[PDB]
Amino acid sequence: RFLKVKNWETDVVLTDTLHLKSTLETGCTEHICMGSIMLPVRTKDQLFPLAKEFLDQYYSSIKRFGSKAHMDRLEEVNKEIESTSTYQLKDTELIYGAKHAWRNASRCVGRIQWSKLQVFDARDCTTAHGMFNYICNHVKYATNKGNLRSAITIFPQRTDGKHDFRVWNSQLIRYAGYKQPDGSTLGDPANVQFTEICIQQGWKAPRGRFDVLPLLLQANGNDPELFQIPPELVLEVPIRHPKFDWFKDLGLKWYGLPAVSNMLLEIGGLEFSACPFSGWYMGTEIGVRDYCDNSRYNILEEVAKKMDLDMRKTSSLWKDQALVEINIAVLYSFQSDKVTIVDHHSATESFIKHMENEYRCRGGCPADWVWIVPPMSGSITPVFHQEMLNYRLTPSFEYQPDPWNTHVW
Amino acid sequence: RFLKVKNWETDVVLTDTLHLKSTLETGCTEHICMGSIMLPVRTKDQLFPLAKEFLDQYYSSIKRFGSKAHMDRLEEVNKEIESTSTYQLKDTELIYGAKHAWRNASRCVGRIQWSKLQVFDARDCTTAHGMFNYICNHVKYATNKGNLRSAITIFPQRTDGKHDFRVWNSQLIRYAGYKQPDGSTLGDPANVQFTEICIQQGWKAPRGRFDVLPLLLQANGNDPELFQIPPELVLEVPIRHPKFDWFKDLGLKWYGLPAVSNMLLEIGGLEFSACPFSGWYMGTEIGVRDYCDNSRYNILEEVAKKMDLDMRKTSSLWKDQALVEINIAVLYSFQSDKVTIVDHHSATESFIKHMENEYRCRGGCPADWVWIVPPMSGSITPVFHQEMLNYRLTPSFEYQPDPWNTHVWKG
Ligand code: HEM
Ligand code: HEM
Ligand SMILES: Cc1cc(N)nc(C[C@H]2CNC[C@@H]2NCCNCc2cccc(Cl)c2)c1
Ligand SMILES: Cc1cc(N)nc(C[C@H]2CNC[C@@H]2NCCNCc2cccc(Cl)c2)c1
Ligand SMILES: C[C@H](O)[C@H](O)[C@H]1CNc2nc(N)[nH]c(=O)c2N1
Ligand SMILES: C[C@H](O)[C@H](O)[C@H]1CNc2nc(N)[nH]c(=O)c2N1
Ligand SMILES: [Zn+2]
């Protein structure tokens, strides 16, 4: 009932009480832990409870719990739900809600930043064009000439499931993927299928290796339309090493704005199916996963051949040597072009400070260890030795079916 | 009920039916996951069912389930339990059990070697000196002049819990730790407390950076006794780098045999409180954890200075760079001295193969991702991209409180 988490590097212990407000399920049982499984319409009766829970905590946060203002709103919404069968969040509730869905993102290591989120209320949007306008502005605001700023743009909430707003891209910015005759894959393998639906819809693919994919926006349930983010708005960084001049010849570049666009924001029972949100990269995301993942740009072998390493035997640890370089480059290039980026050492350290704050100010902090520990140098970052408790709190960011596997054209 | 796991690097999907035999708890609930949590005397009453389940698996393994031998055994064991309150395993069952405890160790990446296990039956042992001889023979056999062999020595099972046999050391071989009055620590910090106990028990500590600790053995619930392992039996490997000739001057070395001695082996309800077991290392255990954990030898800074990396800012990834070289050095030194060891690429690759085989032939392979994933380069090893199901089966290796916290001294 009162759990305690220990850090085996500093012996420090924190007591978690926040997990007791855990609403949703985890996918685990007393017999089986699914901690490493990537992915373990509402009704009026279902909705008022969700709303009440949200509203109670919202008023609690502003120190007006059980006040008239609180009750008043609690009834206003209640009546609205009974009459309309859904409801609208007040601007204040929308912000609090979005900031808190991030606060609860148990897989996000950079939450120490959670309170500083620019929310763009896009609920008055009605068309794919209006969606394109908002997103552009979003990109521009957050990119901010390289000095990145966290932001999220929130489109209308779901109603009957047939008028859903959705951004089809997994991220606002991503390179395309084409399966060539060579049997090989050109570009980013992760987006092969998407890059095809763009062609299937009209895109004029430059069939290059780093073509910024086009936005496929879906409004009010209609069919998605295509748009090409203004090139001047997509800030990119060419990748070079601070010692290996031959590096630049790999012709590697990556975009500065990480912006997740396929998730579903849930606040007080309400569902926001289109809510792109962005921050800034942690070195490893690009250098370790995007570049080295075997099923992504898989550049290890190449960077190895160029380093003149004994790739004859695994035990020489050449992959480990290449990996550290590739990641030194990323952090290097970005810091040079003055684009925001944080390294895995500094990021994990910040998350530790954040965890203590959350434990002593909120009573805990849900955290998914499998995701928090960077994909490289694991045990040399503090979070490796930090025990974590994982539970689901709402408001939240949830996953949702890729739209193409559901859209009734 | 079937459960499926997917590999996100190869899109391979496996189905688990084995978890359906999982009895013990996990620490998790539908509301909370404790996957990253380190550590979440029986009655005649609760013993026979446990004895029964075990013998059923045993007999099925030899394809004699329901045979006359099987039923008589079950009847024999029942009788023995009603009569003595416990029961003795047959040599064949003890060996089957130990192998399966290993096979079921979800935190072990080396499980592909599970069937090749040398089981030493030390159930006839009665004193600490008796234990010392046994442990010495295991160390010699297991070391095999550098060509390591997996082995486990099994002493008498617990009876009334007042006569436990325990090996106080956490590992058969390990360096001492000394706390200095100036706050710093000499040797391995992880063993400072245990070292104090040894000194207190009469150990003349040579106070060096790499002093092999003495064995503190407890037999039949009596007070533990000290023994020094024959130096000529402790295979050690001095650490040097292939390209850096200054590495050797760092003064590092490490013992060649990893042998966990503080776990409890549970087979068919019976509890084996003293059951040392050993195999061979994966580079990273020494190179990443033992050497680089801040709470261990913490050698990252000194290895950084010598290589002259930009240590002013973390983004130069100096710490990451040094690390690779330190692990390269550990692997290198062991291969040069012909002492068995395996790198993490090689070890995880084999586990995936082992794991797959276990699904096809067993219906599952319980695995703890948090522990299976190596402490460095996680994503460039196939296990990182592999979903895993963690659950408990017996026979099994469990944790038990350190004996100094529970032992009732006799003076
Ligand atoms: C500004 C600094 C930020 C940093 C350094 C950061 C870093 C990270 C990292 C390392 C991950 C794992 C990424 C992966 O492996 O796919 C992650 C995931 C996530 N982050 Fe953050 N983040 C930041 C901002 C944000 C913002 C502004 C939000 C939301 C408002 C957010 C929401 C999440 C969520 C929901 C996940 C999990 C999404 C998924 O499954 O891919 N993050 N973050
Ligand atoms: C053949 C060589 C072997 C290799 C390379 C291998 C490797 C490993 C590694 C890397 C770990 C995690 C180490 C740590 O962080 O503490 C581990 C844990 C473990 N291994 Fe193995 N293993 C081997 C043999 C064995 C044997 C022979 C047994 C049992 C008969 C065994 C039982 C276990 C168990 C029970 C754990 C968990 C230890 C704990 O939870 O404290 N291993 N193994
Ligand atoms: C705001 C933000 C900031 C920041 N720094 N990083 C992120 C993370 C996103 C950008 N880098 C990768 C991740 N998006 C991909 C998440 N999906 C992972 C995945 C892979 C296969 C299947 C599934 Cl279901 C999910 C988001
Ligand atoms: C047979 C075997 C083979 C092999 N290759 N490796 C091991 C693993 C042991 C040798 N490397 C470290 C580990 N020791 C036991 C792990 N316990 C860690 C610990 C420390 C402090 C507190 C806790 Cl709770 C746990 C065992
Ligand atoms: C199979 C396993 O769940 C999967 O590879 C996870 C592991 N940890 C991760 N951690 C982060 N941050 N991001 C990921 O995409 C993953 N993938
Ligand atoms: C707190 C956290 O669970 C702890 O640091 C774990 C993580 N994974 C590990 N994995 C292995 N193999 N060995 C360990 O000692 C640990 N420590
Ligand atoms: Zn779990």
Side-chain angles (χ1 to χ4, degrees), chain A residues 130-151:
Chain A
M131 279 174 77
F132 175 63
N133 188 38
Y134 273 102
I135 289 167
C136 280
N137 289 340
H138 173 141
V139 169
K140 189 164 187 160
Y141 176 79
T143 312
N144 194 30
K145 292 182 173 305
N147 175 184
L148 312 184
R149 296 179 292 188
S150 296

Side-chain angles (χ1 to χ4, degrees), chain B residues 37-209:
Chain B
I37 299 285
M38 201 77 104
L39 318 163
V41 190
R42 287 193 174 81
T43 320
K44 292 188 174 184
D45 170 50
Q46 49 200 182
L47 188 58
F48 194 86
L50 284 176
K52 193 190 177 302
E53 310 185 340
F54 167 69
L55 291 172
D56 291 346
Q57 309 164 192
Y58 173 60
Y59 270 97
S60 305
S61 83
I62 43 178
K63 305 198 195 71
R64 297 287 194 285
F65 183 92
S67 72
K68 187 177 183 280
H70 183 196
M71 296 293 120
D72 288 352
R73 183 51 179 159
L74 255 173
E75 199 198 309
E76 192 183 35
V77 172
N78 182 207
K79 285 173 294 172
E80 209 178 319
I81 295 178
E82 63 180 295
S83 166
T84 71
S85 284
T86 181
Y87 75 94
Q88 299 303 305
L89 296 174
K90 289 303 186 180
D91 289 49
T92 57
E93 318 173 323
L94 185 63
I95 297 166
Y96 166 81
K99 293 201 183 177
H100 276 64
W102 186 2
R103 192 188 189 174
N104 293 341
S106 52
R107 285 183 164 163
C108 186
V109 81
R111 283 182 290 178
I112 193 172
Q113 291 279 329
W114 86 268
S115 33
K116 307 145 196 171
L117 178 59
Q118 185 65 216
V119 178
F120 288 119
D121 194 354
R123 293 178 294 168
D124 65 334
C125 186
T126 71
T127 71
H129 279 90
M131 283 169 85
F132 177 64
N133 195 51
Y134 268 112
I135 291 170
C136 281
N137 295 328
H138 172 161
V139 166
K140 194 172 161 178
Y141 168 86
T143 305
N144 190 32
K145 292 161 171 190
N147 183 189
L148 281 34
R149 288 183 288 205
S150 295
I152 175 167
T153 295
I154 306 184
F155 294 109
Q157 64 201 46
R158 174 181 304 171
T159 55
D160 65 358
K162 295 184 184 187
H163 298 62
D164 295 351
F165 283 65
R166 281 299 281 277
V167 168
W168 290 38
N169 301 66
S170 61
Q171 280 172 50
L172 295 188
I173 302 193
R174 238 182 167 203
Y175 302 114
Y178 309 97
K179 191 71 166 175
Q180 292 304 63
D182 72 13
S184 62
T185 300
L186 176 52
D188 192 323
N191 299 310
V192 161
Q193 209 211 328
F194 176 67
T195 293
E196 300 153 4
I197 289 180
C198 291
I199 290 171
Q200 178 171 163
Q201 300 305 317
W203 190 49
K204 309 311 169 183
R207 306 191 72 78
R209 174 128 116 120

Side-chain angles (χ1 to χ4, degrees), chain A residues 8, chain B residues 38-39 171 258-260 277-282 285 290 371:
Chain A
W8 294 86
Chain B
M38 201 77 104
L39 318 163
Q171 280 172 50
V260 160
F277 59 86
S278 57
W280 56 72
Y281 279 110
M282 176 166 80
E285 300 182 71
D290 290 325
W371 278 58

Side-chain angles (χ1 to χ4, degrees), chain A residues 298-305 307-326, chain B residues 324 328 331 344-345 377 380:
Chain A
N298 183 250
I299 73 168
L300 275 173
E301 268 188 57
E302 309 154 51
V303 185
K305 283 171 159 60
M307 296 184 75
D308 191 33
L309 298 167
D310 186 357
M311 298 168 56
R312 290 179 291 175
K313 29 170 285 182
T314 73
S315 52
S316 69
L317 298 192
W318 61 269
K319 280 178 177 184
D320 306 62
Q321 279 190 295
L323 187 63
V324 186
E325 298 310 329
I326 300 183
Chain B
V324 183
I328 278 191
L331 288 166
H344 49 284
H345 299 281
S377 294
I380 54 178

Side-chain angles (χ1 to χ4, degrees), chain A residues 6 8 369 384-387, chain B residues 36-38 289 370-371:
Chain A
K6 170 177 185 184
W8 294 86
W369 196 100
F384 183 83
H385 308 287
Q386 183 64 62
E387 285 175 347
Chain B
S36 83
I37 299 285
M38 201 77 104
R289 316 299 308 288
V370 171
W371 278 58

Side-chain angles (χ1 to χ4, degrees), chain A residues 3-5 8-10 19 22-39 243 288-289 292-295 300 313-321 323-325 327-328 331 335 343-346 369-370 373-380 384-392, chain B residues 3-5 8-9 16 19 22-39 288-289 292-295 300 313-317 319-321 323-325 327-328 331 335 343-346 349 367 369-370 373-380 384-392:
Chain A
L3 303 173
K4 300 178 182 58
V5 308
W8 294 86
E9 182 196 357
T10 62
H19 76 282
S22 173
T23 175
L24 321 173
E25 285 168 56
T26 72
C28 281
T29 72
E30 310 77 27
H31 289 286
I32 217 167
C33 175
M34 301 204 129
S36 68
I37 304 301
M38 292 212 76
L39 316 163
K243 292 187 313 155
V288 181
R289 301 304 300 293
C292 300
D293 254 32
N294 192 271
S295 58
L300 275 173
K313 29 170 285 182
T314 73
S315 52
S316 69
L317 298 192
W318 61 269
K319 280 178 177 184
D320 306 62
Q321 279 190 295
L323 187 63
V324 186
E325 298 310 329
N327 286 270
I328 258 168
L331 298 171
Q335 278 161 153
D343 61 66
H344 54 283
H345 296 293
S346 191
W369 196 100
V370 176
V373 170
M376 84 171 281
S377 298
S379 62
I380 68 167
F384 183 83
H385 308 287
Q386 183 64 62
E387 285 175 347
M388 300 169 190
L389 278 173
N390 198 202
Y391 45 95
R392 305 211 304 180
Chain B
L3 288 174
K4 301 199 313 174
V5 296
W8 299 83
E9 183 189 3
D16 192 280
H19 68 284
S22 167
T23 33
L24 320 177
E25 297 177 63
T26 63
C28 298
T29 78
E30 304 74 89
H31 285 168
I32 204 169
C33 177
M34 307 214 299
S36 83
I37 299 285
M38 201 77 104
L39 318 163
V288 182
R289 316 299 308 288
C292 305
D293 267 13
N294 281 154
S295 295
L300 272 178
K313 50 181 170 58
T314 59
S315 29
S316 57
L317 295 210
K319 275 186 165 189
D320 307 75
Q321 274 188 307
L323 186 66
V324 183
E325 296 311 311
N327 276 274
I328 278 191
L331 288 166
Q335 289 153 180
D343 65 89
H344 49 284
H345 299 281
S346 190
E349 190 182 8
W369 197 96
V370 171
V373 176
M376 87 174 274
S377 294
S379 90
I380 54 178
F384 182 99
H385 306 278
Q386 180 65 59
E387 285 183 330
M388 320 192 165
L389 282 183
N390 190 196
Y391 51 78
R392 294 151 113 224

